[PDB]
PDB file of N, CA and C in Angstrom:
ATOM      1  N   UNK A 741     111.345  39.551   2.866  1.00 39.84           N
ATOM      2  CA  UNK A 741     111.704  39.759   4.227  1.00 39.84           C
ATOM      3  C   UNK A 741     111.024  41.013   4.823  1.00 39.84           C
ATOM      4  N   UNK A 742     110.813  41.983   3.786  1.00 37.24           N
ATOM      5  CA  UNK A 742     109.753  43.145   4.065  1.00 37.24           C
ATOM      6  C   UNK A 742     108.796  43.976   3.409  1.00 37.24           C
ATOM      7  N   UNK A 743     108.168  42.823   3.526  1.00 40.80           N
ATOM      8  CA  UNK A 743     106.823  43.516   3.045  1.00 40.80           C
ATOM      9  C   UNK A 743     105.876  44.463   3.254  1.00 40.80           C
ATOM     10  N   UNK A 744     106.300  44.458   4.705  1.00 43.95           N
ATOM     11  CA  UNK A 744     105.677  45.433   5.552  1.00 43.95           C
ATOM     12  C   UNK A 744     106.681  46.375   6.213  1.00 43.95           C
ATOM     13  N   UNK A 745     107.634  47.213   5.063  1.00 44.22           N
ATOM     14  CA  UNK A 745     108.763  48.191   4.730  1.00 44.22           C
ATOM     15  C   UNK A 745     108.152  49.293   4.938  1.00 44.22           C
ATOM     16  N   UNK A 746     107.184  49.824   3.702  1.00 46.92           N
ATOM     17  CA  UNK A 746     105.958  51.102   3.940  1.00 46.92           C
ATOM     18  C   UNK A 746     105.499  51.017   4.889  1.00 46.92           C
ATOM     19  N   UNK A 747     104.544  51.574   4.774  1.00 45.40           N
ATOM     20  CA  UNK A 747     103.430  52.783   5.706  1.00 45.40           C
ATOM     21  C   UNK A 747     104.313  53.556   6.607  1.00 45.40           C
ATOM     22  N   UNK A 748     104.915  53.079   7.587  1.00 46.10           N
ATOM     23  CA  UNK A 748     105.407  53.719   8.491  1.00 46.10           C
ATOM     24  C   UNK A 748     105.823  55.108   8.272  1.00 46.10           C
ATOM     25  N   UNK A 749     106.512  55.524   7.328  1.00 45.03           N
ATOM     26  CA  UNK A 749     106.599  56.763   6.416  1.00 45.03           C
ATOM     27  C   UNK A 749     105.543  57.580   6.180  1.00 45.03           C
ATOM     28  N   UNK A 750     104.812  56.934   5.716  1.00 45.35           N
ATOM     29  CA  UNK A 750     103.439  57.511   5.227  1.00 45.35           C
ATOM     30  C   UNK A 750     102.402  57.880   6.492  1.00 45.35           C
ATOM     31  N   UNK A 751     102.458  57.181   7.327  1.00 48.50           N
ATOM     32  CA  UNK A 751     101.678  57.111   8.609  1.00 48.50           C
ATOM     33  C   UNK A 751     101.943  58.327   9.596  1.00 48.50           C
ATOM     34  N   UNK A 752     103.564  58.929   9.492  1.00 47.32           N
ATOM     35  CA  UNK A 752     103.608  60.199  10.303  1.00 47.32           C
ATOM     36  C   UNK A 752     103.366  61.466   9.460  1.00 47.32           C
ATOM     37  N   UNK A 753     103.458  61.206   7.759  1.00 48.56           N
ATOM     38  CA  UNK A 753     103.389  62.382   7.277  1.00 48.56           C
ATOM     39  C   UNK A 753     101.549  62.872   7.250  1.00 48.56           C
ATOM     40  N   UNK A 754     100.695  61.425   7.411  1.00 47.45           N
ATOM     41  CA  UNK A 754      99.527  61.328   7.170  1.00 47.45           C
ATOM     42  C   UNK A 754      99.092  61.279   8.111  1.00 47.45           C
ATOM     43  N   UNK A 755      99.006  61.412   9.114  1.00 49.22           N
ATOM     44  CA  UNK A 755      98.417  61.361  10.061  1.00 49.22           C
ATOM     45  C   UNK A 755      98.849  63.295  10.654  1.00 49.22           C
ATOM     46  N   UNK A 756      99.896  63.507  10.243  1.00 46.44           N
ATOM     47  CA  UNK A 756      99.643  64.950  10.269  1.00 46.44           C
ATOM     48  C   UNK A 756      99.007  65.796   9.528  1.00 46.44           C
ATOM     49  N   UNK A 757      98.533  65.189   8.046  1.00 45.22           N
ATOM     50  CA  UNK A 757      97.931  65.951   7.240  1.00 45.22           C
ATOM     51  C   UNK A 757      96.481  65.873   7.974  1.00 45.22           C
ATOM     52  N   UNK A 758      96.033  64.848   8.109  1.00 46.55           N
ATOM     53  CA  UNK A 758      94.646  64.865   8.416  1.00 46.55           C
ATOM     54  C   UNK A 758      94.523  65.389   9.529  1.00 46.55           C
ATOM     55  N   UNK A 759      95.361  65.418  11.000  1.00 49.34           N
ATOM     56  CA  UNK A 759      95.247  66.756  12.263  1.00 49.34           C
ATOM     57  C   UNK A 759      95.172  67.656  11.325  1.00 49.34           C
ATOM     58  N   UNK A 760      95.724  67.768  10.572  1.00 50.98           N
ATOM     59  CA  UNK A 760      96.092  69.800  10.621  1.00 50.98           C
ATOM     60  C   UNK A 760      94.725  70.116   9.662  1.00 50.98           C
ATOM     61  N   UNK A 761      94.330  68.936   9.079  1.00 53.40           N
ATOM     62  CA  UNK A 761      92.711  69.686   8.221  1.00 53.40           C
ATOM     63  C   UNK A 761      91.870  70.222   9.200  1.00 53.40           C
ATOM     64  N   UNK A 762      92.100  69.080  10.593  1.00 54.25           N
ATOM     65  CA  UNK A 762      90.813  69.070  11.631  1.00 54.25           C
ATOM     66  C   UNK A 762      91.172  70.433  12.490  1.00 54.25           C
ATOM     67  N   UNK A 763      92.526  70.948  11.832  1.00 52.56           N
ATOM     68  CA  UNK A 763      93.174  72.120  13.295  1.00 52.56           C
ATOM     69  C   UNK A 763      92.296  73.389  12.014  1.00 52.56           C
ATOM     70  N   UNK A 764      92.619  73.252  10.994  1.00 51.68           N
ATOM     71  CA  UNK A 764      91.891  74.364  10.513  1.00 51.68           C
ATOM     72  C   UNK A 764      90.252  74.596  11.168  1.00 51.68           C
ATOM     73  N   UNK A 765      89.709  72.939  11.123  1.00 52.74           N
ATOM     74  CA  UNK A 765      88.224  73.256  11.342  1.00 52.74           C
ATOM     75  C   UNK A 765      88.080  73.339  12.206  1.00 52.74           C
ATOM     76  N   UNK A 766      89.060  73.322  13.144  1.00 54.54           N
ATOM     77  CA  UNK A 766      88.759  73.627  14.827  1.00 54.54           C
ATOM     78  C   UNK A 766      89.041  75.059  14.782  1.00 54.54           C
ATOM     79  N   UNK A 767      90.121  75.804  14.375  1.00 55.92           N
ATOM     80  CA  UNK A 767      89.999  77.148  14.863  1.00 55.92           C
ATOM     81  C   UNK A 767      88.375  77.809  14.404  1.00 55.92           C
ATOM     82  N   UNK A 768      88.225  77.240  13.110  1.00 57.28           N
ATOM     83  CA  UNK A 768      86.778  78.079  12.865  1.00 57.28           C
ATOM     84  C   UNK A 768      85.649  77.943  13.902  1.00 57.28           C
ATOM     85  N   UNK A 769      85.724  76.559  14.455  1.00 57.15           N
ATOM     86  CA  UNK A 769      84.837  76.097  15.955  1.00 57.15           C
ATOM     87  C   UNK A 769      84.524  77.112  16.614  1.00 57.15           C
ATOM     88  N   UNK A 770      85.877  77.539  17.389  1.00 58.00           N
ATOM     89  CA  UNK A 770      85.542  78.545  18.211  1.00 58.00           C
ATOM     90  C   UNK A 770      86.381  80.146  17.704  1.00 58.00           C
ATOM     91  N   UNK A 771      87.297  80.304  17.005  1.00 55.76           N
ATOM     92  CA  UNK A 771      87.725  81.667  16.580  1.00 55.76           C
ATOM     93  C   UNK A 771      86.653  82.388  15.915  1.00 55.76           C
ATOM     94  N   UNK A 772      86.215  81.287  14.822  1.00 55.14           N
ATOM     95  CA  UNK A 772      85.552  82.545  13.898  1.00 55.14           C
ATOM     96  C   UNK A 772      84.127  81.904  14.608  1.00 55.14           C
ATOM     97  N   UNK A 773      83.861  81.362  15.424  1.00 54.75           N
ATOM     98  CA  UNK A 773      82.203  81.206  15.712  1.00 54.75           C
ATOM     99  C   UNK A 773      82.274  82.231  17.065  1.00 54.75           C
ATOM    100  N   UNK A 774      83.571  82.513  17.369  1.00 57.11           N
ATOM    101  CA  UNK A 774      83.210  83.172  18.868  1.00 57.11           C
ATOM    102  C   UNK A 774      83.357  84.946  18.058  1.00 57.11           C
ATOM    103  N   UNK A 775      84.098  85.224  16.932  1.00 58.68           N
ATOM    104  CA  UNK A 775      84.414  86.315  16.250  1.00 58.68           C
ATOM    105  C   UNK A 775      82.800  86.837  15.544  1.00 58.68           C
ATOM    106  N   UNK A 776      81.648  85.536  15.519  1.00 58.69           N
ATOM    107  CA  UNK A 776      80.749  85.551  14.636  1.00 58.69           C
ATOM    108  C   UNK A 776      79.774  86.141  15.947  1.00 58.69           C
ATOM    109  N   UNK A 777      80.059  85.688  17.417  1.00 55.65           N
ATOM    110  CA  UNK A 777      79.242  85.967  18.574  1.00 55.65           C
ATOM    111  C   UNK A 777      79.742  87.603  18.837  1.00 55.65           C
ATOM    112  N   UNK A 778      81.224  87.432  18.581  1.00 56.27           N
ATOM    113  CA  UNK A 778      81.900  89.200  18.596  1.00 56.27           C
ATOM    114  C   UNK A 778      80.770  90.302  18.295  1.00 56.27           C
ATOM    115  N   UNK A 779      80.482  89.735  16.917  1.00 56.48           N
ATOM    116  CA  UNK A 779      79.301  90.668  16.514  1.00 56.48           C
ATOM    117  C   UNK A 779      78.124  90.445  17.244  1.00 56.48           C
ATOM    118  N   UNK A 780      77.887  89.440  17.746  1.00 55.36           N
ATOM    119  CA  UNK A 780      76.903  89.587  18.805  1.00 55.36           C
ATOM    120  C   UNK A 780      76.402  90.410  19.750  1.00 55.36           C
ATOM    121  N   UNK A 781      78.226  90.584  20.189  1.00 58.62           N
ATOM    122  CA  UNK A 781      78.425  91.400  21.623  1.00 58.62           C
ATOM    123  C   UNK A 781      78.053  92.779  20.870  1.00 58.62           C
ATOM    124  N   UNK A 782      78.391  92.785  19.668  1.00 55.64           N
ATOM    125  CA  UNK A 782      78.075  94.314  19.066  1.00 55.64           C
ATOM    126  C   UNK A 782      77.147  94.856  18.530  1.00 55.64           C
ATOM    127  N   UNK A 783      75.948  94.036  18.536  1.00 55.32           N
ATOM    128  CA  UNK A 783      75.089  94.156  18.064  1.00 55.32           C
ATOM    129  C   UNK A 783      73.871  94.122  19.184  1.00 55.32           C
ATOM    130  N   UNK A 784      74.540  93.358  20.517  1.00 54.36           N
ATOM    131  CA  UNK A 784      73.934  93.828  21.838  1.00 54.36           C
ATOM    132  C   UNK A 784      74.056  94.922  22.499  1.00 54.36           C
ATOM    133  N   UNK A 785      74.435  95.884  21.620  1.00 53.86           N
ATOM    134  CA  UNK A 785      74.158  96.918  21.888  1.00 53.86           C
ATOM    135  C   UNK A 785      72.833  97.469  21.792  1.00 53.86           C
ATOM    136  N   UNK A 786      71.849  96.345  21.196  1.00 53.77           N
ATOM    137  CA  UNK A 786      70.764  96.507  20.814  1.00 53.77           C
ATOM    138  C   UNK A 786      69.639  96.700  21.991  1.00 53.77           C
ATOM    139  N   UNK A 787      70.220  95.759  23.081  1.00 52.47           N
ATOM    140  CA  UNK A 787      69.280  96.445  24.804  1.00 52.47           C
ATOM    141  C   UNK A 787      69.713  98.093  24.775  1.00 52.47           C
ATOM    142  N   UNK A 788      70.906  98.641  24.741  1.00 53.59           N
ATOM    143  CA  UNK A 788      71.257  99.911  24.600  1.00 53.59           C
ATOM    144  C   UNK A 788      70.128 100.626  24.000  1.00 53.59           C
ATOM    145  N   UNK A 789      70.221 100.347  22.976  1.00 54.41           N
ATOM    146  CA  UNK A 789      69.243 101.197  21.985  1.00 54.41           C
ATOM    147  C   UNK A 789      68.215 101.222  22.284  1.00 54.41           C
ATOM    148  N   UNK A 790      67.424  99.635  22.986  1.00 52.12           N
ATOM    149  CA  UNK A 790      66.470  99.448  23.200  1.00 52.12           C
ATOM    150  C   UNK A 790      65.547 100.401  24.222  1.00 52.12           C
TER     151      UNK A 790
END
């Protein structure tokens, strides 16, 4: 009568695991790529010097 009992369970815990891998690789997107430009800004200090 139910065979199709599972997934449903599995489907909200899994479907959050796999967002939250993509939320890690999103903060690196722009946190640590804009933290990586940070040094940019600090290293444009280099017209300064220039």
């Amino acid at each position: 009568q139910l065979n199709d009992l599972e997934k449903l369970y599995e489907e909200k815990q899994d479907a959050l695991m796999r967002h939250e891998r993509e939320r890690r690789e999103i903060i690196t997107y722009e946190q640590e790529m804009r933290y990586s430009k940070l040094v940019d800004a600090e290293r444009q200090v280099r017209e300064e010097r220039l």
